[PDB]
Amino acid sequence: SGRGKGGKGLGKGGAKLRDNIQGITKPAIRRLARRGGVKRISGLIYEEVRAVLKSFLESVIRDSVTYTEHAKRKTVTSLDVVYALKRQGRTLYGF
């Protein structure tokens, strides 16, 4: 029993991608364009729309996170977005 070696000692216990990429797609932008009333479009719009998201979403995101930090809430609620929308000049009803 004592002499020799073998695996019968269970173990001691050791330890044993977060980059993320932007989404959206061309058909979604095409549907949004068709909602806006455009007959024909060129092939250079999608990059610019993606730029509009990359310039619009992140700013309100920063304002929202600094607001909820100013509220001393370690979580984000839908009501926090409404403050950002109000100070951005485009308010949303329903939340």
Binding site: T91, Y93, G94, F95
Partner: protein, 88 residues
């Protein structure tokens, strides 16, 4: 918590006795009423700070430049009729 669903419900009922409501629309109306109240009330506060001093004239004038005049005259007239009804 005191909701405002009852008042808007009875106003809809006295203006439309067979038209229903949707839950999303209830929040829509609640937010509309709340933010209009706050907007006109801070307008009244800034109109009180307008005069070099510490009523109803301030609120009448505040509603008199915040919303289009066509509905503004009706608003002030019906408010005055309401206060006359409440006076005695």
């Amino acid at each position: 918590k005191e909701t405002y669903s009852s008042y808007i419900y009875k106003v809809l009922k006295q203006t439309h006795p067979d038209t229903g409501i949707s839950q999303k629309s209830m929040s829509i109306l609640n937010s509309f009423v709340n933010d209009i109240f706050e907007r006109i009330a801070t307008e009244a506060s800034k109109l009180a700070a307008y005069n070099k001093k510490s009523s109803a004239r301030e609120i009448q004038t505040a509603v008199r430049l915040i919303l289009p005049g066509e509905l503004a005259k009706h608003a002030v007239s019906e408010g005055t009729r309401a206060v006359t009804k409440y006076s005695s």
